[PDB]
Amino acid sequence: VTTEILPVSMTKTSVDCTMYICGDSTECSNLLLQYGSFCTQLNRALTGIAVEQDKNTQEVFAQVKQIYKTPPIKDFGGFNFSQILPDPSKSKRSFIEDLLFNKVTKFNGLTVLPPLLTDEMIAQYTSALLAGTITSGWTFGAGAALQIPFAMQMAYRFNGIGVTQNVLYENQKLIANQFNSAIGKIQDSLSSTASALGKLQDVVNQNAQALNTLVKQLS
Amino acid sequence: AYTNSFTRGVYYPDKVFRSSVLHSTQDLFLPFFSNVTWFHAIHDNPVLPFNDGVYFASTEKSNIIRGWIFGTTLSLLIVNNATNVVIKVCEFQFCNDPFLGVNCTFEYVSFKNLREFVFKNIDGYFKIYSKHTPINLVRDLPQGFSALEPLVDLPIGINITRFQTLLALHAAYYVGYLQPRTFLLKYNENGTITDAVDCALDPLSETKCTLKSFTVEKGIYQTSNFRVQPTESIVRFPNITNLCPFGEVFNATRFASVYAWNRKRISNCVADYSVLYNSASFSTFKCYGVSPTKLNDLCFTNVYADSFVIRGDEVRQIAPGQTGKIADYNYKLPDDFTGCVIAWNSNNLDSKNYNYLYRKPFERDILQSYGFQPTNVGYQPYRVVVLSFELLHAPATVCGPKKSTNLVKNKCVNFNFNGLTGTGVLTESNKKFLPFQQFGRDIADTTDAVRDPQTLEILDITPCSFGGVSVITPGTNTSNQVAVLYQDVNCTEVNVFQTRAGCLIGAEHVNNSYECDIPIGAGICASYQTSQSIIAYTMSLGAENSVAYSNNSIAIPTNFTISVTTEILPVSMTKTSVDCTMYICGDSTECSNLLLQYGSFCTQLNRALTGIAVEQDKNTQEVFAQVKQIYKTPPIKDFGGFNFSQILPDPSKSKRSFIEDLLFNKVTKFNGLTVLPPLLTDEMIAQYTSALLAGTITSGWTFGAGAALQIPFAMQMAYRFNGIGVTQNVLYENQKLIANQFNSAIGKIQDSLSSTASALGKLQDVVNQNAQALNTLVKQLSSNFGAISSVLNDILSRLDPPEAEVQIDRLITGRLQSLQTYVTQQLIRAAEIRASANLAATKMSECVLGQSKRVDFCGKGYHLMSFPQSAPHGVVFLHVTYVPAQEKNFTTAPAICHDGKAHFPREGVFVSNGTHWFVTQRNFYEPQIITTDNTFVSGNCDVVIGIVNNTVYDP
Amino acid sequence: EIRASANLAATKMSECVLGQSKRVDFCGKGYHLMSFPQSAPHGVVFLHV
Ligand SMILES: *[C@@H]1O[C@H](CO)[C@@H](O[C@@H]2O[C@H](CO)[C@@H](O)[C@H](O)[C@H]2NC(C)=O)[C@H](O)[C@H]1NC(C)=O
Ligand SMILES: *[C@@H]1O[C@H](CO)[C@@H](O[C@@H]2O[C@H](CO)[C@@H](O)[C@H](O)[C@H]2NC(C)=O)[C@H](O)[C@H]1NC(C)=O
Ligand SMILES: *[C@@H]1O[C@H](CO)[C@@H](O[C@@H]2O[C@H](CO)[C@@H](O)[C@H](O)[C@H]2NC(C)=O)[C@H](O)[C@H]1NC(C)=O
Ligand SMILES: *[C@@H]1O[C@H](CO)[C@@H](O[C@@H]2O[C@H](CO)[C@@H](O)[C@H](O)[C@H]2NC(C)=O)[C@H](O)[C@H]1NC(C)=O
Ligand SMILES: *[C@@H]1O[C@H](CO)[C@@H](O[C@@H]2O[C@H](CO)[C@@H](O)[C@H](O)[C@H]2NC(C)=O)[C@H](O)[C@H]1NC(C)=O
Ligand SMILES: *[C@@H]1O[C@H](CO)[C@@H](O[C@@H]2O[C@H](CO)[C@@H](O)[C@H](O)[C@H]2NC(C)=O)[C@H](O)[C@H]1NC(C)=O
Ligand SMILES: *[C@@H]1O[C@H](CO)[C@@H](O)[C@H](O)[C@H]1NC(C)=O
Ligand SMILES: *[C@@H]1O[C@H](CO)[C@@H](O)[C@H](O)[C@H]1NC(C)=O
Ligand SMILES: *[C@@H]1O[C@H](CO)[C@@H](O)[C@H](O)[C@H]1NC(C)=O
Ligand SMILES: *[C@@H]1O[C@H](CO)[C@@H](O)[C@H](O)[C@H]1NC(C)=O
Ligand SMILES: *[C@@H]1O[C@H](CO)[C@@H](O)[C@H](O)[C@H]1NC(C)=O
Ligand SMILES: *[C@@H]1O[C@H](CO)[C@@H](O)[C@H](O)[C@H]1NC(C)=O
Ligand SMILES: *[C@@H]1O[C@H](CO)[C@@H](O)[C@H](O)[C@H]1NC(C)=O
Ligand SMILES: *[C@@H]1O[C@H](CO)[C@@H](O)[C@H](O)[C@H]1NC(C)=O
Ligand SMILES: *[C@@H]1O[C@H](CO)[C@@H](O)[C@H](O)[C@H]1NC(C)=O
Ligand SMILES: *[C@@H]1O[C@H](CO)[C@@H](O)[C@H](O)[C@H]1NC(C)=O
Ligand SMILES: *[C@@H]1O[C@H](CO)[C@@H](O)[C@H](O)[C@H]1NC(C)=O
C-alpha cells in the first residue's frame, strides 16, 4: 500500500480592498475611488478563487449520489479496514484520517471564509466511497451499488491485472495478511514522519506567506 | 398628516445625454419610500427645516400654491403670480403668516395637475429641478416614477436653513428631505430615466446597485461590509497644568550668534501653538514636519527651540536639503527634519552691531562678524527660532490645550491617545510595557495596545467588529424577498440563525435537510420553499442507503437502459486584440510621445494578447480537427434502428445538426478594442463534427486508428458491448429495445436543451467573463487616476505642456496599469481555456474516436460511444452509456466442488436461484449450465474458502 | 495549480477508487487492484493497493 497526497483546495481568503488600503478613512477612500474598478475587481477576483474551492472539493469527494455505510458485521474475507473506516466513538473520521489531520496545520480587511463542506461532511463522503468500494466494488460508480463478497471482488481485481483468480483464493489468507500488515506500516509512517504530508503543508505555508506578505506591506 | 413618497424625488443629475444605460450616481435625492409631511389648504404656511435640501410636491386644481421663501430668519423669494415668475434676493418685510390673494443682490423676472420640485443649495448655488404632469386623483400623491429636469440655477451665496411656502387665499402639498444616497438610474432607448434603484433602501437594492442591474439572478452576492460605529470619543493626555515657555524663546531680550546657537528644552507642559501661527509679527512661518494648524491636536515626547541671529538673505538656508555658509558651517538641519522654522525682522532690536558672529546636524562647533545697521533688507538681522519636534510615538510630555474626556472601556469608541488616533474597543490587558514604552505595535505597524496617558495601566485595542455582508436571494423573477448574512460576526451589534459563517437574518431555520441550492458556508445552504419563504438548513450530502452485504450474496443486473448525458466544455475564448497606444493615447501626439518613455511596456501587451488570440485556433484545431478526411453519411440511413437525425447535419440549412442549432441558440469599440475572427468558422466546425459523426457511425473507431472501414452499425455496437464486459448476444437479442432507448434518450436531450437555458451555462460563463473583462477595461477610461480629467482631449485643450504632461502621465499610468491587469487576467483565463481544450481534445480521441475504459471520463456509466456537437466557443459531447436498471439478489460462491477438484469460471460468477447453481456474466444476469467448457480447475476443495458442492457437466 | 491538482485528484477518485486503473503508475507504483480515499486538511489522500 502506497500513499499519494494531493491538494484539493486552498484557503478561501477574502480581502476588503478598501479597508486594506483606506482603513476607516474618508479622505483616503475618496482618493481611492479615483481609480475606478481597480479596487473592486480585486474583490471580485478573490471571490472567484474562493468559490472554485468548493467546486474543487465537490468534484473530488462528491462522486457518489448516495451515502453508503458498512454493515455491523465486518466480514471481508480476512481484510481488516478498521483503520480506514470511520471511528464511531469520535466527528466520524477514520483512525488514519485523524493521523492526517494531526500533522497538517486579521483587522486589516483580511478575513477567511469557511468551506461549504466541513470536515464532518467530507468524512461522510469518504465513508460513502469506502463503503461502496468495500461492499459493492465498482458497481456504485457505474450505477446502483450492488453487493459482492469481498473475496469475489478481489477476484475481479486480480483478473484486472492479468492474474488468474485462483491465485487469490489459494493465497487468500496470505493476501489478506499482507494487506493488513501494509496498513499497519501506513500507520507507523504517518504517525511519525511529519514530512509525510508535506504536499498539503506546503499549500498551507504558501498561503500563510502570501497573507503575511500582504499585511507586512502595510508597514 | 404624512404620506409615502414611493419612488418620487429623482432627477437628471447633470446635463449629459445618455441612453440604453444604467448609470450610478451619488447626489441629494429623496430616499425611496421616505416619510414626507402632508399639508392642506382646506377650511397652512408653517416654517419648515431646509436641512441639506428639500423635495417639494403638490397637487392642484386652482393653482393655489404659488411660491416659497428661503433663508434663515425669514432672504430668497420665489413667486409665480399669474404668468410672471419673480425671483428676488431682497430685504423684503414678511408677515408672520405671508400669503397671496386670489437692498437686493439678485433679481429676475420671467386634482388635475402634479408639480414636483427639488431645491438644493451647493457652493452658493440654489439649484431648482422640476416636472409637471397631469393627474386624476384627490386623495394622495399618485404612485409612479418620473425624473425631474434642471430649470433654474441661482448664483446667490445665500444661507438657507429654513423655508416657508406661499398659498393664494380667497391644494395639498408634500415636503420631504434629500440625502446623499447613491442611485442606479435606468435610461431607456430615448435617454429618459424610466426607473431607479435606491442603493441604501434595503439589501435587494444593494444587490441591484452592486451588480449594476435591475434583475438579480438566483444566488448569494457580497454587496457591502458591516462595521460597528463608535458611540463616543475618548481624548487622553497627561494631566499637566503648566504651560510651555514659548514666550521666553520668541520674546527674549537677546539671541545667540549663529555659530553658537542656543538650545532650549521644552518638556512637561501645555503647548499652545495658536499664538505662534496666528501672530502677524513673523515674516515667515514654514513647517517641514507637520502643518501649523495640526500642532494643537498632535503632541511630542519633546520640543527643542534653537535660537539665533542671521542675515535676512540667510533665512533661506535654514531648511532640510539646503547648503551654504550657514547650512554647512554654523547650523545644519537633518534632511529628514521634523519641525517648524519661524523668523522675523529684528532691525529695530539688534541693529546699531558686531556682537553677532558666524563661521553634522545640530552641531555646535565653537570666525567673522556681521555688520548689522538700521539702514542696511537682505543684510538686516533676523531672529530665527527653529522648533525641532520629536514626534516619535514615545511617552508625550509636550501636548497642546486639547480638552480631555474620561476613559470609556468595553465599547466601540473613537480614541485619541497623545495625538494617536483610531477606532476600536478598549479592553483590559495582561501585557506589561517597559517604563519607556507608551505604545505597542502589531505586524501591520498598527497600534496593538497603549499605556493610558494619565493612568499607568495597559489597554488593549480591539478594532470594532466588521465583516462582509452577503445577500441571499431567489431570482427576482420569482421573489423580492431576501435574507442577509453578516460574515464572521455574532448576532449582537448587527427569525435569526447563528451559523459558523456569520449571523443570518431573515432565513427560517429548518430541521429538514435538502440538497444544497444557494450555499452559505460551513454546511449551511438556503432556498425559497414552503406560502414560500427563504429557509436555511444543513445541506444533504445525498440519500442514505446501505449495501446488502454478506459473504455469500451478490446482486446482478437483470435489465439495463441506454442513457445519454451531455458534457459541455469550453474550447476557445474570444480572440480579442487591444491597441495599447490607441487605448491609452487615442489620436494624441503629446500623450504618445510620453507613452514611448515606457519602452516596451505598451507593445509587450499587444504581443501577449496576440499570443492568446493565436492559441485559440490551436485549441479549436486540437479538439475538432482529429480526422484527416471529411466523411459523410450514406443517403440511406440504415443503422439498425438507431436514429441519428438529430445529431447529423440538416441539409436544408450552414450544415449544422438540429441539436447543434439548439446549442447555438442558447449561448451568446472605438477605444482600440477590436475582435478578430476565428480561423475556423461555424460552418467549418460543422464540417469537422460531421466528419467525426459520419466516421463514428459508419466505421466505428477504425477512422481514428487509420483508414475508415465500414462496419454495420449493429456489429459496431456488438464491439461496444464487449468493450464493457457484456456479451454481444445481449445486444442482438435486445437490439430493438436498445435502439428504442437510444432514440428516446436523444428526444430527452432535445427537450432539456431547448427549454433549460442553464443547460449551456459552462459556455455562457466564458462569454460572460470575457464581456466583463472588456467592459471593465473600457470603463477604466472614464477614471481620473488623480488627473483633472479622464478625457485626454480635455487635458490638452486646457493646459499648456509644462502642466498638461503631468496630468497625462497620471492617465498613462492608470491606463497602462489597467491594460496590464486586463492582460494578466486574459493570460490566466487563457490557461484555463487551454486546459479545458486539452481535456476536450483528449475526450474527442478517447470518447468519440475510440471507446473509453476510464470511469466517469465519458459519461456516468459504462461507456459505449460518444457523438460530438459544436457550440459557441466550445464542444458538446453526447455520451452514450450502459447503465444497470434492475437487479436481483443471488446466492454465490467463489468456486464449485465436483469430484474434489475446485472449479472456477473462466468468466463471470457462480450464482444460485435457491435450488440450482449457474454460471453467468458479471454485468447481466443470464444463467448458464455449469460445464467443463465454462469453468477451469485449479487447486481443490480443502483450499478454497467458501467453496460449495455442485456438479459440473462434461459433454 | 490547486485547481489542476483537484482535477487530477477527481480523476483519480473515479479511476483509482470507483473503478480499477489500467494506467501505469497512475494509481500506485505496481499493478493496480484498488484504492481507498482518506480526507486531509485542504486535500485528499489516496491509499493505493
Ligand atoms: C483489525 O485491526 C485492529 C488493529 O488496528 C484490531 O484491534 C486490536 O485487536 C487486538 C486483539 O483483540 C487487541 O489486543 C488490540 O488492543 C486492538 N487494537 C486496537 C487499536 O483496538 C482488530 O481486532 C482487527 N480486527 C479483526 C477482525 O481482525
Ligand atoms: C511468498 O511470500 C510470503 C511473504 O510475503 C511468504 O509468507 C511468509 O512465510 C514465512 C515462512 O517462510 C512466515 O514466517 C511469514 O509469516 C509468512 N508471511 C505471511 C504474511 O504470511 C510465503 O510463504 C511465500 N510463498 C512461497 C510459495 O514462497
Ligand atoms: C428519426 O426521428 C425523427 C424525429 O426526430 C423522425 O421524424 C418524424 O417522423 C414522423 C413520422 O413520419 C413525423 O410525423 C414527424 O413530423 C417527423 N418529425 C420531424 C421533426 O421531422 C424520423 O422519421 C425518424 N426516422 C426514422 C427512420 O425512424
Ligand atoms: C427492460 O426494461 C425495458 C424498459 O427500459 C422494458 O421495455 C418496456 O416494456 C414495457 C412493458 O412492460 C413497455 O410498455 C415499454 O414501452 C418498453 N420500453 C421500450 C423502450 O421498449 C423491457 O421489457 C424490460 N425487460 C425485462 C426482461 O424486464
Ligand atoms: C432454478 O432454475 C431451474 C432451471 O430453470 C428451475 O428448475 C426448472 O423449473 C421449471 C418450472 O419453472 C421446470 O419445468 C423444469 O423442468 C425445472 N428444471 C430442472 C432441471 O429441475 C428451478 O425451479 C429454479 N429454482 C428456483 C428456486 O427458482
Ligand atoms: C462437499 O461434499 C463432500 C463429500 O463429497 C463433503 O465431505 C465430507 O466432509 C465431512 C466433514 O469433514 C466428513 O465427515 C465426511 O466424511 C466427508 N464425506 C466424504 C464422502 O468423505 C464436504 O464437506 C462438502 N463440503 C461442503 C462445503 O459442503
Ligand atoms: C411618519 O412618521 C410618523 C411618526 O413616527 C408616523 O406616525 C407616520 O405614520 C409615518 N408615515 C409614514 C408614511 O411612514
Ligand atoms: C407679479 O408680482 C410682481 C411683484 O413681485 C409685480 O411687479 C407684477 O406686476 C405682478 N404681475 C401681475 C400679473 O400681477
Ligand atoms: C443694506 O446693507 C447695508 C450693509 O452695509 C446696511 O448698512 C444697510 O442698512 C442696509 N439697508 C437696508 C434697507 O436694509
Ligand atoms: C421614443 O420616442 C418615439 C416617438 O418619437 C416612441 O414611439 C418610442 O416608443 C419612444 N421610445 C421609448 C423607449 O419610450
Ligand atoms: C570632530 O573633531 C575631529 C578632529 O578630532 C574633526 O576631524 C571632525 O571633523 C570633527 N567633527 C565635526 C562634526 O566637526
Ligand atoms: C493624572 O492625575 C492623577 C491624579 O488623579 C495622577 O496621579 C497622575 O499621575 C496624573 N497623570 C499624569 C500623566 O500626570
Ligand atoms: C420571468 O418573468 C417573465 C415576466 O413575467 C415571464 O414571462 C417568464 O416566463 C418568467 N420566467 C420564469 C422562468 O419564470
Ligand atoms: C455570541 O455571544 C454569546 C454571549 O452573549 C456567546 O455565548 C456565543 O457563543 C457567541 N456566539 C458566537 C458565534 O460567537
Ligand atoms: C429541531 O428539533 C428539536 C427537537 O428534536 C427542537 O428542539 C429544535 O428546536 C428543532 N430545530 C429546528 C430548527 O426546527
Ligand atoms: C437484497 O435483499 C436486501 C434485504 O432484504 C434488500 O434490501 C435489497 O434491496 C435486495 N436487493 C435486490 C437487488 O433485490
Ligand atoms: C458466511 O457467514 C455466515 C454467517 O456469519 C457463517 O455462518 C458462514 O460460515 C460463513 N461462510 C464462510 C465460508 O465463512
Side-chain angles (χ1 to χ4, degrees), chain A residues 1-23 25-64 66-118 120-219, chain B residues 1-92 94 96 98-135 137-138 140-163 165-310 312 314-324 326-327 329-352 354-362 364 366-374 376-389 391-427 429-441 443-487 489-492 494-586 588-614 616-627 629-681 683-914 916-955, chain C:
Chain A
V1 178
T2 63
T3 301
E4 183 178 16
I5 301 174
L6 301 170
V8 175
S9 65
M10 60 184 281
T11 301
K12 291 171 67 176
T13 63
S14 178
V15 182
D16 176 340
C17 65
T18 299
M19 186 174 176
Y20 176 83
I21 298 168
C22 299
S25 173
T26 299
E27 296 81 6
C28 184
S29 180
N30 287 343
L31 293 169
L32 183 58
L33 292 171
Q34 294 180 344
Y35 291 89
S37 297
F38 269 136
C39 191
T40 58
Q41 73 182 282
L42 296 170
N43 287 345
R44 184 171 67 206
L46 291 171
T47 298
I49 292 168
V51 171
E52 73 182 51
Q53 300 314 303
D54 290 306
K55 290 180 180 179
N56 288 339
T57 301
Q58 290 171 344
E59 288 170 351
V60 175
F61 294 99
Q63 296 191 349
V64 61
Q66 299 184 314
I67 304 302
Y68 298 116
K69 297 179 180 176
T70 56
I73 301 169
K74 303 293 185 294
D75 182 356
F76 303 113
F79 290 78
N80 190 317
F81 302 119
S82 70
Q83 294 182 57
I84 62 171
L85 296 173
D87 182 340
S89 70
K90 298 294 192 288
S91 177
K92 264 63 180 173
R93 303 193 302 209
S94 71
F95 167 75
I96 289 168
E97 285 174 316
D98 283 340
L99 293 175
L100 296 171
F101 277 89
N102 291 331
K103 298 298 188 188
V104 175
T105 63
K106 185 181 177 183
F107 295 105
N108 292 294
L110 281 76
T111 66
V112 178
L113 301 172
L116 181 60
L117 300 175
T118 65
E120 174 62 22
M121 289 180 167
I122 298 301
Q124 290 180 29
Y125 279 119
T126 58
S127 180
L129 292 170
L130 289 166
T133 299
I134 294 166
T135 63
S136 63
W138 45 74
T139 60
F140 80 91
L146 307 181
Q147 74 271 20
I148 185 167
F150 192 76
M152 290 176 68
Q153 179 175 308
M154 289 302 292
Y156 296 3
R157 300 274 177 183
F158 269 63
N159 282 340
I161 60 165
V163 178
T164 305
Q165 74 271 38
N166 68 292
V167 173
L168 170 66
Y169 293 119
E170 292 174 16
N171 294 287
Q172 183 174 330
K173 289 176 77 71
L174 175 60
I175 293 166
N177 286 335
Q178 290 172 345
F179 176 77
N180 293 340
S181 292
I183 292 170
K185 289 190 284 188
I186 295 297
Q187 173 184 148
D188 287 344
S189 179
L190 292 173
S191 74
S192 64
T193 300
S195 66
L197 283 87
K199 288 182 73 166
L200 298 174
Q201 185 62 45
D202 188 65
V203 173
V204 172
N205 291 343
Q206 289 183 39
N207 287 330
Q209 186 64 56
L211 291 168
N212 287 338
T213 300
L214 181 62
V215 175
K216 287 173 184 174
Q217 287 298 94
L218 291 168
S219 72
Chain B
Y2 296 90
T3 191
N4 188 334
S5 70
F6 292 99
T7 59
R8 303 291 183 183
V10 173
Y11 59 88
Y12 292 88
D14 63 18
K15 298 177 181 174
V16 176
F17 177 85
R18 297 180 180 82
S19 66
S20 299
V21 64
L22 308 182
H23 179 71
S24 175
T25 185
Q26 183 178 21
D27 207 335
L28 296 172
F29 297 101
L30 188 68
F32 278 8
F33 300 98
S34 69
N35 198 340
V36 300
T37 302
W38 185 3
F39 301 89
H40 289 279
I42 63 174
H43 296 292
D44 194 14
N45 307 295
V47 176
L48 305 173
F50 186 77
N51 297 339
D52 294 326
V54 176
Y55 172 79
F56 185 90
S58 63
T59 57
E60 287 282 352
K61 183 176 179 180
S62 57
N63 296 313
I64 298 303
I65 298 162
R66 298 179 183 181
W68 305 268
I69 306 165
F70 297 93
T72 56
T73 59
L74 296 167
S75 295
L76 169 63
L77 176 62
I78 301 171
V79 179
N80 187 23
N81 55 303
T83 62
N84 293 311
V85 176
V86 178
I87 301 174
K88 292 181 177 179
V89 185
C90 300
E91 297 294 346
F92 187 86
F94 291 100
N96 288 339
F99 64 91
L100 307 172
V102 176
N103 276 25
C104 298
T105 60
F106 177 89
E107 181 173 4
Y108 168 81
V109 180
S110 293
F111 295 107
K112 300 296 186 181
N113 290 281
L114 171 64
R115 302 174 70 199
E116 297 179 65
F117 299 86
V118 179
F119 299 100
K120 67 183 190 182
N121 185 344
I122 300 173
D123 298 333
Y125 293 89
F126 189 75
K127 296 177 185 285
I128 303 170
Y129 301 74
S130 65
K131 177 72 179 175
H132 293 177
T133 185
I135 61 169
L137 179 65
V138 175
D140 208 343
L141 287 171
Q143 182 176 355
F145 178 88
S146 180
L148 276 59
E149 298 175 4
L151 183 65
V152 181
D153 188 334
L154 307 173
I156 300 166
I158 185 168
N159 190 22
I160 301 169
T161 61
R162 301 190 299 164
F163 76 99
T165 63
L166 295 167
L167 303 173
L169 306 178
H170 295 81
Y173 64 92
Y174 308 84
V175 177
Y177 296 92
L178 307 176
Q179 296 185 336
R181 290 169 177 261
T182 299
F183 282 76
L184 182 67
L185 305 177
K186 180 175 180 181
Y187 291 81
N188 69 6
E189 295 83 0
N190 296 6
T192 297
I193 299 167
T194 61
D195 206 343
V197 179
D198 181 329
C199 300
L201 175 62
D202 66 44
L204 181 58
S205 293
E206 289 175 345
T207 302
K208 287 180 176 183
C209 289
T210 297
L211 301 175
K212 297 194 82 176
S213 179
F214 283 64
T215 299
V216 178
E217 299 296 338
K218 184 175 185 182
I220 182 167
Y221 304 91
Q222 183 175 290
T223 63
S224 193
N225 293 286
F226 173 75
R227 297 181 178 87
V228 174
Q229 302 300 302
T231 298
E232 61 184 309
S233 64
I234 300 170
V235 180
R236 297 258 97 194
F237 296 95
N239 52 85
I240 298 167
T241 62
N242 296 325
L243 268 67
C244 296
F246 284 102
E248 298 185 41
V249 176
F250 289 88
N251 272 295
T253 298
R254 299 186 296 278
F255 278 52
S257 292
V258 71
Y259 91 97
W261 48 274
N262 289 335
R263 185 169 183 81
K264 293 179 180 177
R265 182 172 184 268
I266 299 169
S267 67
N268 295 312
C269 60
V270 178
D272 184 345
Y273 292 98
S274 71
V275 172
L276 291 171
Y277 180 66
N278 288 330
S279 171
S281 69
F282 296 118
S283 66
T284 182
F285 198 112
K286 171 66 179 177
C287 295
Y288 299 100
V290 302
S291 293
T293 60
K294 295 289 187 291
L295 289 170
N296 293 319
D297 293 304
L298 60 98
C299 65
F300 314 101
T301 193
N302 63 52
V303 177
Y304 295 93
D306 292 330
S307 170
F308 55 97
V309 177
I310 60 170
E314 293 171 353
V315 171
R316 70 186 179 85
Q317 292 181 47
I318 302 171
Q322 299 298 301
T323 64
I326 302 305
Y329 301 97
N330 295 273
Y331 185 77
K332 173 68 171 173
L333 296 177
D335 291 326
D336 56 337
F337 172 76
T338 299
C340 299
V341 179
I342 303 167
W344 63 101
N345 186 289
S346 61
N347 191 54
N348 64 330
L349 303 177
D350 296 305
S351 296
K352 295 185 179 182
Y354 295 91
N355 293 330
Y356 290 104
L357 308 174
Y358 64 98
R359 297 177 73 201
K360 292 183 179 182
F362 303 116
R364 181 181 288 107
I366 303 300
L367 183 63
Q368 296 177 283
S369 61
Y370 292 106
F372 292 129
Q373 297 179 55
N376 285 353
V377 176
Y379 294 91
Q380 292 182 6
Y382 281 70
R383 285 176 174 206
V384 54
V385 178
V386 180
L387 302 179
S388 170
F389 294 154
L391 184 58
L392 185 146
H393 293 105
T397 71
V398 181
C399 301
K402 188 75 175 185
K403 180 72 184 79
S404 67
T405 72
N406 291 312
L407 176 67
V408 178
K409 295 183 283 188
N410 300 319
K411 297 185 181 181
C412 183
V413 296
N414 185 337
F415 56 82
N416 183 328
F417 296 106
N418 295 327
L420 182 145
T421 66
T423 300
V425 179
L426 306 178
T427 67
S429 182
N430 64 332
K431 297 177 182 181
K432 306 291 184 182
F433 286 17
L434 298 174
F436 59 89
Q437 295 176 324
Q438 185 65 27
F439 299 88
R441 295 284 171 83
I443 192 168
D445 201 32
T446 63
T447 302
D448 186 55
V450 299
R451 186 169 68 182
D452 187 275
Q454 295 183 355
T455 299
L456 299 176
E457 68 184 7
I458 306 303
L459 305 174
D460 285 336
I461 301 172
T462 301
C464 299
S465 176
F466 71 97
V469 180
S470 296
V471 180
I472 299 161
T473 185
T476 56
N477 224 69
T478 299
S479 176
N480 290 319
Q481 187 178 99
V482 300
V484 179
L485 175 70
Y486 293 81
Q487 295 170 22
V489 298
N490 202 338
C491 296
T492 56
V494 174
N495 195 28
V496 180
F497 180 23
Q498 181 75 65
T499 70
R500 290 177 179 175
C503 183
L504 176 62
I505 301 170
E508 182 178 359
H509 186 197
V510 176
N511 257 334
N512 295 322
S513 62
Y514 303 92
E515 295 84 359
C516 186
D517 191 0
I518 301 170
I520 297 173
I524 305 301
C525 298
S527 64
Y528 192 72
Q529 299 183 353
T530 58
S531 294
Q532 293 177 310
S533 67
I534 298 169
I535 64 169
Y537 50 87
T538 301
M539 65 179 281
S540 174
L541 305 183
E544 183 177 353
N545 203 354
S546 179
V547 175
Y549 182 85
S550 71
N551 52 342
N552 62 349
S553 180
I554 188 164
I556 301 168
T558 62
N559 202 343
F560 66 93
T561 58
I562 304 304
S563 64
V564 179
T565 63
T566 301
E567 183 178 16
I568 301 174
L569 301 170
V571 175
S572 65
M573 60 184 281
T574 301
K575 291 171 67 176
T576 63
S577 178
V578 182
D579 176 341
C580 65
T581 299
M582 186 174 176
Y583 176 83
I584 298 168
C585 299
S588 173
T589 299
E590 296 81 6
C591 184
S592 180
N593 287 343
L594 293 169
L595 183 58
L596 292 171
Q597 294 180 344
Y598 291 89
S600 297
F601 269 136
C602 191
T603 58
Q604 73 182 282
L605 296 170
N606 287 345
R607 185 171 67 206
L609 291 171
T610 297
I612 292 168
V614 171
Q616 300 314 303
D617 290 306
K618 290 180 180 179
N619 288 339
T620 301
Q621 290 171 344
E622 288 170 351
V623 175
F624 294 99
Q626 296 191 349
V627 61
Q629 299 184 314
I630 304 302
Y631 298 116
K632 297 179 180 176
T633 56
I636 301 169
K637 303 293 185 294
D638 182 356
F639 303 113
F642 291 78
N643 190 317
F644 302 119
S645 70
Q646 294 182 57
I647 62 171
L648 295 173
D650 182 340
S652 70
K653 298 294 192 287
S654 177
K655 264 63 180 173
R656 303 193 302 209
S657 71
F658 167 74
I659 289 168
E660 285 174 316
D661 283 340
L662 294 175
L663 296 171
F664 277 89
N665 291 331
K666 298 298 188 188
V667 175
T668 63
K669 185 181 177 183
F670 295 105
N671 292 294
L673 281 76
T674 66
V675 178
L676 301 172
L679 181 60
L680 300 175
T681 65
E683 174 62 22
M684 289 180 167
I685 298 301
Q687 290 180 29
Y688 279 119
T689 58
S690 180
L692 292 170
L693 289 166
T696 299
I697 294 166
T698 63
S699 63
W701 45 74
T702 60
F703 80 91
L709 307 181
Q710 74 271 20
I711 185 167
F713 192 76
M715 290 176 68
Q716 179 175 308
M717 289 302 292
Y719 296 2
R720 300 274 177 183
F721 269 63
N722 282 341
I724 60 164
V726 179
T727 305
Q728 74 271 38
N729 68 292
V730 173
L731 170 67
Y732 293 119
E733 292 174 16
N734 294 287
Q735 183 174 330
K736 289 176 77 71
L737 176 60
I738 293 166
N740 286 335
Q741 290 172 346
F742 176 77
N743 293 340
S744 292
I746 292 170
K748 289 190 284 188
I749 295 297
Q750 173 184 148
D751 287 344
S752 179
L753 292 173
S754 74
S755 64
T756 300
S758 66
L760 283 87
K762 288 182 73 166
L763 298 174
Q764 185 62 45
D765 188 65
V766 173
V767 172
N768 291 343
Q769 289 183 39
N770 287 330
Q772 186 64 56
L774 291 168
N775 287 338
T776 300
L777 181 61
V778 174
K779 287 173 184 174
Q780 287 298 94
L781 291 168
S782 72
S783 294
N784 288 335
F785 306 114
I788 61 170
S789 176
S790 64
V791 178
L792 181 58
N793 288 349
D794 291 341
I795 293 168
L796 291 167
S797 71
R798 291 188 295 168
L799 300 178
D800 287 341
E803 297 179 357
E805 290 176 358
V806 173
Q807 298 302 314
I808 294 166
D809 283 345
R810 291 177 187 183
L811 294 180
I812 291 168
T813 298
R815 289 178 176 178
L816 182 59
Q817 183 179 17
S818 182
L819 289 167
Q820 290 169 351
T821 299
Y822 171 80
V823 172
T824 298
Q825 290 170 5
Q826 291 289 97
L827 288 166
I828 294 168
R829 187 177 298 108
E832 183 174 354
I833 296 296
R834 186 171 66 249
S836 182
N838 287 340
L839 180 60
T842 299
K843 287 170 174 280
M844 190 70 79
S845 292
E846 295 180 34
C847 301
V848 176
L849 273 63
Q851 180 171 15
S852 176
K853 298 297 290 180
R854 296 170 66 187
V855 173
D856 301 340
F857 188 67
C858 302
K860 219 276 190 189
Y862 292 102
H863 180 249
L864 294 171
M865 67 189 306
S866 301
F867 301 101
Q869 300 284 268
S870 65
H873 303 289
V875 64
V876 178
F877 291 95
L878 302 178
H879 299 298
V880 182
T881 62
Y882 177 103
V883 180
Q886 301 178 347
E887 313 93 32
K888 176 173 175 179
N889 280 341
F890 298 97
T891 295
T892 189
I896 290 174
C897 293
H898 180 70
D899 59 350
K901 292 175 179 61
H903 291 251
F904 301 92
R906 287 185 171 86
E907 181 58 281
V909 298
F910 292 128
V911 298
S912 170
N913 75 351
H916 292 78
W917 287 90
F918 304 93
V919 58
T920 192
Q921 67 186 319
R922 292 175 187 171
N923 294 300
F924 187 80
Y925 180 65
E926 185 179 58
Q928 299 184 43
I929 300 301
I930 299 167
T931 75
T932 59
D933 293 330
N934 291 325
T935 66
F936 68 90
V937 175
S938 182
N940 63 63
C941 298
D942 294 328
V943 177
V944 177
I945 298 167
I947 195 164
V948 301
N949 272 301
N950 208 52
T951 63
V952 179
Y953 175 73
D954 184 356
Chain C
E1 183 174 354
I2 296 296
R3 186 171 66 250
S5 182
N7 287 340
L8 180 61
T11 299
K12 287 170 174 280
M13 190 69 79
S14 292
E15 295 180 34
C16 301
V17 176
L18 273 63
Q20 180 171 15
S21 175
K22 298 297 290 180
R23 296 170 66 187
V24 173
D25 301 340
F26 188 67
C27 302
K29 219 276 190 189
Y31 292 102
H32 180 249
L33 294 171
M34 67 189 306
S35 302
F36 301 101
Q38 300 284 268
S39 65
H42 303 289
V44 64
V45 178
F46 291 95
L47 302 178
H48 299 298
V49 182

